[PDB]
C-alpha cells in the first residue's frame, strides 16, 4: 500500500524515519501519466517492503511540492535520513525500479 500524505507535518514525519528508504510519488489527479504510474507504484511497494512508499497530491499540498522543486508529475523522490538521495521524473518504470533497488 502507498500511503497518501495530506499535509506538511505528515510529509515531514514520513521523512523523519531514519535509515529506512522513503519514496514519495508527487502526483496530480488530472495528470494522465500520474494515473498511469499509480497501479505500478503499488506493485513496487509490495515488492520492496524494506522501503516505505507514499503519495503526495501537488495541488493539495502545494507548498511541499514547491519546496522540493517538483515542477513535473509524476516525480518520485527518494529519501534517506530525511534528505533526498535521488529523484526520477516521469512515468519511467525501469528508472523507478532501479532507483529503488540501488537505494533500498
Amino acid at each position: 500500500m502507498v500511503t497518501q500524505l495530506k499535509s506538511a507535518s505528515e510529509y515531514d514525519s514520513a521523512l523523519a524515519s531514519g535509515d529506512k528508504l522513503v519514496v514519495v510519488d508527487f502526483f496530480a489527479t488530472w495528470c494522465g501519466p500520474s494515473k498511469m504510474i499509480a497501479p505500478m507504484i503499488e506493485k513496487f511497494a509490495e515488492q520492496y517492503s524494506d522501503a516505505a512508499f507514499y503519495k503526495l497530491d501537488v495541488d493539495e499540498v502545494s507548498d511541499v511540492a514547491q519546496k522540493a522543486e517538483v515542477s513535473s508529475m509524476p516525480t518520485l523522490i527518494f529519501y534517506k535520513g530525511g534528505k533526498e538521495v535521488t529523484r526520477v521524473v516521469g512515468a519511467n518504470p525501469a528508472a523507478i525500479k532501479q532507483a529503488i533497488a540501488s537505494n533500498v
Binding site: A28, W30, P33, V58, S71, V89, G90
Partner: protein, 174 residues
C-alpha cells in the same frame, strides 16, 4: 531611458511552464515554475526579451512572435543568444498553450513568461493601460548583454505596429 544601464531586475519574478521533447521522453505533466529576473540575467550572457499585449491576440500571434520563433535557431547558433523571453501578463497555462499553438517544441532557449499584474513591465515604463486600472504589456523589445541593457524600445501603437519590437529590429542590435 534604460539603455547602457544595468538591467533593473530588482526582486521581480516571472512564471512559465516548461515544454520539452525529452521530458516527453519521460511523459509527465508540467507545472508553472517561478524564475527570478536577476538569476536569469546572471546565468545567461545574452538575453532577448520581447513583450506583447495579450496571448492569442491577432497582431501578437500573426505579426510579432512568429518572427522570434522563426529566427530562434539563427539567434542561438550564429548570434550567440542564450535566452529569448516572451513577456505577457497572461496566466502561465494560457501562455504555454499559446507557445504550443505557435510551434514551440522546447523551452531551453525560448520561454513564455507571465508578468503577473504587469509588475515588471510597468517598472520599466513599457505597460499598456487597457482601462479601470488594468494593465497589459505594451509591445516592446530589449537586448541584455552581460547584465547591461544595450537596446530597449516600445511601440507607440502596440495594437497595430511591429516596428521597434520586431525580431528584425533586434537582430540589427546584435
Amino acid at each position: 531611458d534604460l539603455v547602457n544601464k544595468k538591467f533593473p531586475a530588482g526582486d521581480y519574478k516571472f512564471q512559465y511552464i516548461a515544454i520539452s521533447q525529452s521530458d516527453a521522453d519521460s511523459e509527465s505533466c508540467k507545472m508553472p515554475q517561478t524564475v527570478e529576473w536577476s538569476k536569469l540575467i546572471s546565468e545567461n550572457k545574452k538575453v532577448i526579451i520581447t513583450g506583447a499585449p495579450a496571448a492569442f491576440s491577432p497582431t501578437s500571434t500573426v505579426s510579432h512572435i512568429p518572427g522570434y520563433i522563426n529566427y530562434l535557431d539563427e539567434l542561438v547558433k550564429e548570434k550567440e543568444v542564450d535566452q529569448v523571453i516572451v513577456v505577457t501578463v497572461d496566466n502561465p497555462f494560457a501562455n504555454q498553450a499559446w507557445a504550443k499553438s505557435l510551434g514551440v517544441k522546447d523551452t531551453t532557449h525560448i520561454k513564455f513568461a507571465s508578468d503577473p499584474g504587469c509588475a515588471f513591465t510597468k517598472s520599466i515604463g513599457f505597460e499598456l493601460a487597457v482601462g479601470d486600472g488594468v494593465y497589459w504589456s505594451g509591445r516592446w523589445a530589449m537586448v541584455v548583454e552581460n547584465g547591461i541593457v544595450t537596446y530597449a524600445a516600445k511601440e507607440t501603437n502596440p495594437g497595430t505596429d511591429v516596428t521597434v519590437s520586431s525580431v528584425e529590429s533586434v537582430l540589427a542590435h546584435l
